[PDB]
């Protein structure tokens, strides 16, 4: 996409990730894992509630009936209200088409940067104890057990802890 | 060894249009465009006035069907397909700008006029086309003046309402167009008639046209109506030899209400702030495809079905 | 050892407007607005009907120019400045909604009334304003009513036409207004004058009027037109003495069309779906800058002379 | 600009690509050679024939006279009916501008990201075995023949095969 | 050994709306929407012409209060409330049609009838209404037309106007409507009365009307104006038998002006290019919140009192 | 935001800089102090002064007067002039409020692109000499004076005279 991350270099999604919108999935000696991320997923979740926000806000215009519904108009002026009434619509009508796509585009972009936001996060976290996959993934060149891998997750991961041991196994 | 990031996906998404695409695939997305029409006047906290078979006009002048409304008070006022305004042949000039000035009204009260007549006139003019208690009577607002004995020729009369209210009230007269001139005659009599009406703002002549006309109800003659508003202060002066549909009340319009044309049932389990045809629409979004005529606040008239805004980021299956 | 990334450019790029700079260069653009009009009516598929120096009205009364435009189907309408409908001077009262109600048709038909009159009544009354192979005529979809002996009085004649079709008709008469007080006494008489129509819907009474004017066509008399709408069933009355021009044929207007105000050249090898006066506009852009006055399947007229879109990155210059 | 890629980081673009919109040029031992990438040119390309298949879509949204264009309309009602058709067309035209101005600024920032996107592609290709000027371009620390430029241009790349003599010269 | 970046932030930063937040703090912003409006006309770089106490009706007929402005040429016009339009009762037919006509146009000329009558014809009537020097006076384009002697009757009298300038003229005439049927036989006649109007481009008939009313300025009887444009090189006729008073000299307008109507003071060092009935609008600003109703160059009414633009960039607070 | 720099690994800015809207701060042995960047400064300013010349712009759409301020109108034909008003008022109200909306937010995340650039344009830059902690501040490896802080803000920084310096601290 326009920030490349979604669809991007990240093949897909997890449909397993139910319990939020970003998550890790991370492997180690002990096993497998799994859990979400609540900033990336709250500021996607709390963006489009205000955008659906704007939607919902009515207008307080009043409109009577100048068009009689059963009895018959002057026939000039019935004309000049038929024209005006369809110029009306013809607005409303590609006006809302607009707003759909313009919100649409722009809601998909903004779900794609909060992606590589995290990323960009969890990148400049791992320093040089780590170096990326191209998949969108992190090889970490040193043994990272599952206390550690939330001290990331919790951010509170130091670098200097892993530094000597990370450096070495990345030049043998 | 290795920490891995990634988004959510579901097995069935939804598709929206984009700048760049018309074809994606979202995760999760909701609509805009309102299709969903409940076919009731949702009228709960509203004091709402049917109208049944009586149409606006019709509650000035005095119809037999519409006897029930001709006074009340309301902040909305429904109207119905089919709804009877003459029960004698005719119409009045401009109805429209007349009809759609009641459904804007908030309540009408009626005043009478305070008009004598003399001993050659019989003000007790009816009709078989309106019908009241099952025999024959004369639209309630009015009163149709005919010599008292036939051929003997209607006297020119002077009859003047005048107006003491603060407010401004509509006065409502009717004209006569005979079907013969041998029937002209024995009505109003030989004699040339025209009926003049002056006040301040208003002044019009207008001559009863005599000939041959289609049945309508059973009847060849018919009654066009006129319409006016006086000032307060102001004075109404009539000057006739026969011909004129005298008022013995005038209208005079409350406040300000809302006038709804739909034929839909009534309800007052639900309320709308949106009315149609067919209806009331209930709904939050701003757009809707069911009709371009409306009335109230209402979402705005689209011509696309559905316009679906997305909720969620793409979509990719696993 | 060494791999560098970039992008395509362009030496003389193409300038845009954008939301943050006034004069902005890329690759490639293209229009939006339409600038390029064509000259001509593109008539291709559509089977249309050329009135030229005639007038829409003039074919339902049957002014000398239409004798060909009586009777026929089109699916559009095309109208040519200074054109004719009054042979004799005059004008149609509620001109415009009845030229816009026969533009918005799609096509003409005819029905002839057949209406008798007595023996002291001539109904072959003819003007030399409207000409037809050089000898006097009249109207070809009217009769003008005069007393047999030049100075009597007109009978009380009464015509009504019957609606015996599933679908609406439209009457047209004409009314004489005179030059000089001795015309109405020798071709309708010394009694007085007065002509009542009726039908359901519609009923009305309008008298001769005399006075002197200006000579249009060498003609100093005047004949006005009035049309109303005979529905399914109902039947239309005349009742008069003279001063009448009676109709010797009705119209019924089939189906739609498409109706253009052009003074332009027909193409039938050219295709089209919007008009405007000065011929066709053919384009899939969305805008124009040529003219708000348009009819038909037409794109959006703006104030702007040229707006481009980008279609293509950034033009970097070396 | 958005993205700082075209107009950014890089100096310039290149006048002589006739083939694609985003390439690759390489400087090795056996000379230079021109080639654009497929896949990163038709994602901008196909981006653009979709705003193009937007701005065709017929408006058959009929219109038919309501001012004679050849004789006279009433005073009062024909005025009225100016004030309506230079509001309808004031609003059509700011609604013209507004659209080119807004969609130039995307396809603009659309560009500029559809590179940077392949130049984060091939970064992670190379990944160790390359290093960034600012210019923007990679400079490959191992020997990379024609046959190895294939490769990172057509995916195919294996930094496994050619990590250990990268870090040698690095660090020296 | 270290080096940092960042991004400056005020201390009171001001809250905009953006897409997706309702409140968003920003270093700075300003307002696209004007909410002041100065109470005073700014008429520099303008010739303008103060109606004052008269209306622009008043100019083409000759009310005592327009006698200061009978002719004259400008660029913009300007309308006071309570302005005296006719000293005289009456009103004219489609008055704001023609008071528009006025506002349209930048001057008026004045060129003269030349209208001679028999000599059973007094045009020297006059009127108290329209006070002149504490005397008897009529309007100053219009010459009142009644018999000579009181209880003669009126002559059938045919007059002309010729329109021999490359430009159109504005005619103008009034149909008089007795008070009753013994002022009608007083002045006109006991003759049948009738008013027609004849030219190529217009026609028309009236009849005056009997009948008694309230006194407006003293005054129960009434006249109704009516008016149309003699095209270049047409001719225009009145036939009238009595009861319409004929025009001296006819109306003549020029160029385009600017209609402004508001009562506030005029100020002639401030220049301002778009008006409304409260004062004057002087902005930069795309949007207005301050009146609908406006006249000019102007920014487009919206129905916010307030829309900021983020001038700066998201304010963090440090 | 989108850039994930103006309230996103930048924790906030500076009060204290009145001299510009992006800027360094720099932290060595002979003390700390402050100099504003001049580049990326107007870069911002020159998008927002677009915007801002872009909409005070006045077209002249002269609109003649249709109902009278003192005369009565017309009732039926009220209605027809009641009824497009407030259409179109409802209109530029909607339109006014939706490039407002618009606008805004571009220019939020216009100003995330320039602090990105200017973020991206250092890192490139300084190659290997240095590391990025993640809160928007990068360390060297080795000892800057006031010339050496100076150099990367006027943008004459050489990489590799502290290339083998910077890469031994590094390592140890
Ligand atoms: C098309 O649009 C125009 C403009 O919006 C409408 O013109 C308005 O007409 C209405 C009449 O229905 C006017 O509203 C009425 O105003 C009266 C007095 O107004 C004065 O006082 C106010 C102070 O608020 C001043 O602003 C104003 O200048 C006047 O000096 C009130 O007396 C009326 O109240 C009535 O209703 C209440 C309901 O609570 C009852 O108590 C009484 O019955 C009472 O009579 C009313 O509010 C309005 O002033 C006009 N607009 C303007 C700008 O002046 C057209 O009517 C409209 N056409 C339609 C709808 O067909
Ligand atoms: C302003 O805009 C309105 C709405 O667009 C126009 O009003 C329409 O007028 C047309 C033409 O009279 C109507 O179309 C007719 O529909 C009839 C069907 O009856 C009902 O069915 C429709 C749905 O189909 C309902 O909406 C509604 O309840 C209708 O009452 C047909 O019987 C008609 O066909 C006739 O003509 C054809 C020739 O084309 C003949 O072959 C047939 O025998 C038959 O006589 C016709 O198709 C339409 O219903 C009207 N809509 C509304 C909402 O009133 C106005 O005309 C327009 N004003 C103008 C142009 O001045
Ligand atoms: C609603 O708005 C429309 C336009 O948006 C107006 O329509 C125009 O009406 C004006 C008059 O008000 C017309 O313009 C005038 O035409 C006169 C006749 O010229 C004809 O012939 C020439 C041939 O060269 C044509 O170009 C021209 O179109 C005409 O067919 C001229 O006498 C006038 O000239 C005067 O003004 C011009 C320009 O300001 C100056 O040179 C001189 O001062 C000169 O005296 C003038 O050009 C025009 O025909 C109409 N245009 C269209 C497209 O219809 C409506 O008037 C308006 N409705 C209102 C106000 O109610
Ligand atoms: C067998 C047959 O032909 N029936 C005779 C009838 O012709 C006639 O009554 C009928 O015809 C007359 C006129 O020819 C009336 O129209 C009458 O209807 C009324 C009506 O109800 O509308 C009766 C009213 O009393 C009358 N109103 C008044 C007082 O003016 C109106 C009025 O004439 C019209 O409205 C004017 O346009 O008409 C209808 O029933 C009767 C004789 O009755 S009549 O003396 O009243 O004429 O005889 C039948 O045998
Ligand atoms: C100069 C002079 O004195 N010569 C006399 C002629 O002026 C006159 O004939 C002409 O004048 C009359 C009006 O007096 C008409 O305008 C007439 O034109 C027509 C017309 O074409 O419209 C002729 C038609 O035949 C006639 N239509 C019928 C059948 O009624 C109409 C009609 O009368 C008018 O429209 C009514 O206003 O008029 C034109 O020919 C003749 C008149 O005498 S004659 O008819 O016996 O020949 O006398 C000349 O001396
Ligand atoms: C105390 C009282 O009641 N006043 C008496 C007046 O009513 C009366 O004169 C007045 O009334 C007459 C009609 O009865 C007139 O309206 C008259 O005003 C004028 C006017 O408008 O200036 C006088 C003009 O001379 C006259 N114009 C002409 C030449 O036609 C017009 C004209 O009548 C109307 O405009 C036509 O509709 O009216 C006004 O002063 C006098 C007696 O005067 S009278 O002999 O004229 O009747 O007595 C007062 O005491
Ligand atoms: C109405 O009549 C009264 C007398 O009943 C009178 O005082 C008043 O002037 C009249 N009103 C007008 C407006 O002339
Ligand atoms: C009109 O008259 C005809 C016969 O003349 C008749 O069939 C028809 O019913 C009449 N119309 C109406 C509406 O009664
Ligand atoms: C999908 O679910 C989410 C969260 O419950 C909601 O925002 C969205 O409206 C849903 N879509 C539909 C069509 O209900
Ligand atoms: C732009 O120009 C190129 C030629 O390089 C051409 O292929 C393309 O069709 C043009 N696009 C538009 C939209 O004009
Ligand atoms: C904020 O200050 C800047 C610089 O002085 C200026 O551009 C802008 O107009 C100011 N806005 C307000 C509301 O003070
Ligand atoms: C006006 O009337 C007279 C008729 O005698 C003449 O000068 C002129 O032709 C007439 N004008 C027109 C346009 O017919
Ligand atoms: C740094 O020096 C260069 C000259 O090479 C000059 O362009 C730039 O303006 C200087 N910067 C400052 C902050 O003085």
């Known amino acids: 996409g326009l920030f490349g991350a979604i669809a991007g270099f990240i093949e897909n999604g997890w449909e397993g990730m139910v319990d939020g919108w970003y998550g890790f999935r991370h492997q180690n000696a002990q096993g497998t894992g799994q859990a979400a991320d609540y900033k990336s997923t709250q500021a996607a979740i709390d963006q489009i509630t205000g955008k659906l926000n704007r939607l919902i806000e009515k207008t307080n215009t009043e409109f009577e009936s100048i068009e009689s519904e059963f009895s018959e108009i002057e026939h000039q002026i019935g004309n000049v209200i038929n024209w005006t009434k369809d110029s009306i619509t013809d607005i409303w009508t590609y006006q809302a088409e607009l707003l759909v796509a313009m919100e649409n585009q722009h809601t998909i972009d903004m779900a794609d940067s909060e992606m590589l936001n995290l990323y960009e996060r969890v990148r400049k976290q791992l320093r040089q104890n780590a170096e990326e996959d191209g998949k969108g993934c992190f090889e970490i060149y040193h043994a990272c057990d599952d206390s550690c891998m939330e001290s990331i997750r919790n951010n509170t991961y130091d670098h200097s802890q892993y530094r000597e041991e990370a450096l070495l196994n990345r030049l043998n | ?318």
Request: with cysteine; charged share 20%; net charge positive.
């Open chain 2, 1 to 318: 060894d290795k920490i891995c990031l990634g988004h959510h996906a579901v097995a069935n998404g939804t598709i929206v249009k984009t700048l760049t695409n018309e074809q994606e695939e979202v995760t999760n997305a909701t609509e805009t465009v309102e299709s969903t029409s409940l076919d009731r006047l949702c009228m709960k906290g509203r004091s709402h006035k049917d109208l049944g078979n009586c149409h606006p006009i019709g509650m000035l002048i005095g119809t037999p069907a519409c006897d029930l409304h001709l006074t009340g008070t309301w902040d909305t006022l429904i109207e119905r397909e089919n709804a009877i305004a003459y029960c004698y042949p005719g119409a009045t000039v401009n109805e429209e700008a007349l009809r759609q000035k009641i459904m804007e009204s908030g309540g009408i009260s009626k005043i009478s006029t305070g008009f004598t007549y003399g001993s050659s006139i019989n003000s007790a003019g009816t009709t078989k086309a309106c019908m009241r208690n099952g025999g024959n009577s004369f639209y309630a607002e009015l009163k149709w003046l005919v010599s008292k004995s036939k051929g003997q020729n209607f006297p020119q009369t002077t009859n003047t309402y005048r107006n003491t209210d603060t407010a401004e009230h509509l006065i409502m007269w009717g004209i006569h167009h005979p079907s013969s001139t041998q029937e002209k005659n024995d009505l109003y009599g030989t004699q040339s008639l025209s009926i003049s009406v002056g006040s301040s703002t208003y002044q019009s002549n207008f001559v009863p046209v005599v000939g041959a006309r289609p049945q309508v109800n059973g009847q060849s003659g018919r009654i066009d109506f006129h319409w006016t508003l006086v000032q307060p202060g102001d004075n109404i002066t009539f000057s006739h030899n026969g011909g004129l549909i005298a008022p013995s009340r005038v209208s005079k319009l409350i406040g300000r209400g809302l006038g709804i044309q739909s034929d839909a049932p009534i309800d007052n389990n639900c309320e709308s702030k949106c009315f149609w045809r067919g209806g009331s629409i209930n709904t939050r979004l701003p757009f809707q495809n069911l009709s371009p005529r409306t009335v109230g606040q209402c979402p705005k008239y689209v011509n696309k079905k559905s316009l679906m805004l997305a909720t969620g980021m793409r979509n990719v299956p696993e």
